[PDB]
Amino acid sequence: FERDISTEIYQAGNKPCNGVAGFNCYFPLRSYSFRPTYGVGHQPYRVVV
Amino acid sequence: WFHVIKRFDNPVLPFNDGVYFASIEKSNIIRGWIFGTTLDSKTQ
Amino acid sequence: LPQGFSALEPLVDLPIGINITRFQTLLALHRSGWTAGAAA
């Protein structure tokens, strides 16, 4: 029941990412692949809890 | 124990667990508190 | 702190659902610089 809205770049190594991706730095946010011509895995589902 | 009089004690302390706040206050000097991980726009 | 027993009834259970790891209290000042009364 906690929402994560931090846009900080994830740091894996000792080099500071300085807000951008690079060596041992990756963007935690990834986009979905919702398309109507694909299978169940790419099919979006409306989940309400 | 923190005393305010010319004393201005407004420190920042980490929130590791629950806290108990007792105030011997007159004329409602205290108004509220601020809670946050880093107290900036990067967090809520 | 006076010595005694005082029940603490619940008032508000707000479902905040966020991470909290630090806190800082707020104070109100009076302008006559600024002058603050006795408090603890």
From Swiss-Prot, chain B:
Highest classification ranks of the organism: Viruses, Riboviria, Orthornavirae, Pisuviricota, Pisoniviricetes
The organism's place on the tree of life at top rank: Viruses
Subunit structure: Binds to host ACE2. RBD also interacts with the N-linked glycan on 'Asn-90' of ACE2. Cleavage of S generates a polybasic C-terminal sequence on S1 that binds to host Neuropilin-1 (NRP1) and Neuropilin-2 (NRP2) receptors. Interacts with host integrin alpha-5/beta-1 (ITGA5:ITGB1) and with ACE2 in complex with integrin alpha-5/beta-1 (ITGA5:ITGB1). May interact via cytoplasmic c-terminus with M protein. May interact (via N-terminus) with host bilirubin and biliverdin, thereby preventing antibody binding to the SARS-CoV-2 spike NTD via an allosteric mechanism.
Protein name (Swiss-Prot/TrEMBL): Spike protein S1
Residues of the full protein shown: 64 to 115 of 1273
Job of this protein: Attaches the virion to the cell membrane by interacting with host receptor, initiating the infection. The major receptor is host ACE2. When S2/S2' has been cleaved, binding to the receptor triggers direct fusion at the cell membrane. When S2/S2' has not been cleaved, binding to the receptor results in internalization of the virus by endocytosis using host TFRC and GRM2 and leading to fusion of the virion membrane with the host endosomal membrane. Alternatively, may use NRP1/NRP2 and integrin as entry receptors.
